[PDB]
Amino acid sequence: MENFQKVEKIGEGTYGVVYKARNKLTGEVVALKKIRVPSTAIREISLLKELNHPNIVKLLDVIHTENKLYLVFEFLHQDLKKFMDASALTGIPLPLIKSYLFQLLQGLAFCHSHRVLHRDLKPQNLLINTEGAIKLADFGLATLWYRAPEILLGCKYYSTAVDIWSLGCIFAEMVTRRALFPGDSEIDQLFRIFRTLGTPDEVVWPGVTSMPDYKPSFPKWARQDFSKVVPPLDEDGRSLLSQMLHYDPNKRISAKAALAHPFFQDVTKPVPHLRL
Ligand SMILES: Brc1cnc2c(NCc3cncnc3)cc(-c3ccccc3)cn12
Numbered sequence: 001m002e003n004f005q006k007v008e009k010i011g012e013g014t015y016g017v018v019y020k021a022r023n024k025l026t027g028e029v030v031a032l033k034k035i036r037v038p039s040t041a042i043r044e045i046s047l048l049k050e051l052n053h054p055n056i057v058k059l060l061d062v063i064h065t066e067n068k069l070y071l072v073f074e075f076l077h078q079d080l081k082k083f084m085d086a087s088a089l090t091g092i093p094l095p096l097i098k099s100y101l102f103q104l105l106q107g108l109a110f111c112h113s114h115r116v117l118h119r120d121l122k123p124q125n126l127l128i129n130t131e132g133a134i135k136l137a138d139f140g141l142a143t144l145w146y147r148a149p150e151i152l153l154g155c156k157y158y159s160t161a162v163d164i165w166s167l168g169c170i171f172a173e174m175v176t177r178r179a180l181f182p183g184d185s186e187i188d189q190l191f192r193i194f195r196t197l198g199t200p201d202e203v204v205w206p207g208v209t210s211m212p213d214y215k216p217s218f219p220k221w222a223r224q225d226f227s228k229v230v231p232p233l234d235e236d237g238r239s240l241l242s243q244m245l246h247y248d249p250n251k252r253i254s255a256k257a258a259l260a261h262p263f264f265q266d267v268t269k270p271v272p273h274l275r276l
Pocket residue numbers: 009010011012013018020031057073074075076077078079124125127137138
């Protein structure tokens with residue numbers, strides 16, 4: 001760690017704090033995550049080091065010293081949460097929303113093909129640069145707003161589909177400029193989802209009633225139309241969103257399939273206006 005000069009804290013990760021730092025030697029500016037060691041964690045983290053893709057934040061180095069664990073990542077200047085707040089008056093242009101969604105799906109498709117899940121996607125961990133790129137941060141390391149219903153209902157062996165759900169929630173949020181399901185407790189999160197998408201049943205989600213935390217006593221709400229949920233998103237966008245928000249994880253669209261959706265027929269790569 002003495003090889004690094006901390007510049008400033010850039011947030012509080014799930015395991016440790018993240019700092020912008022300078023490699024006293026190389027001169028490199030990086031993001032340093034201090035975790036906060038199990039041999040299994042060491043080995044697992046080491047494998048993530050080989051998982052390289054344009055839309056995944058590069059894990060540069062893993063430093064286990066003093067029985068301490070630091071993760072050195074490439075540094076990006078802004079995150080999507082800040083960008084969304086900055087764009088709150090006018091909203092992010094549709095072409096940029098589409099480009100970002102497309103890139104994130106490419107990132108997920110890659111991770112998922114390698115059997116790596118994110119599990120905790122949220123705007124704060126989607127990082128952007130001046131070139132119009134967006135990257136997933138914290139993939140494989142593992143607010144309730146983005147949590148998939150199967151996680152809330154106590155499924156222990158959830159799948160890659162949880163990331164598609166989180167990303168669909170983020171897509172909606174970019175479009176409307178409001179969080180889709182801003183729950184403040186696990187039950188409030190679940191019920192917010194039910195109020196909008198309808199209380200799930202065996203018809204739309206076989207096996208739902210046998211899940212660990214399902215209760216027959218859950219209120220039965222009817223489903224709302226997406227036209228009410230994400231105006232003014234066009235029919236291609238609404239159709240994709242609906243697929244990303246399917247209750248049954250086995251029915252939910254995969255990242256790979258989503259990339260082929262008609263919504264992306266006219267995708268481009270615009271450059272955002274960033275104030276750093
Ligand atoms: Br790896 C990594 C590489 N760059 C970031 C980064 N940069 C955005 C930023 C830059 N300067 C100041 N504030 C934010 C934020 C977070 C992060 C922050 C909070 C939670 C999760 C991830 C992780 N990062």
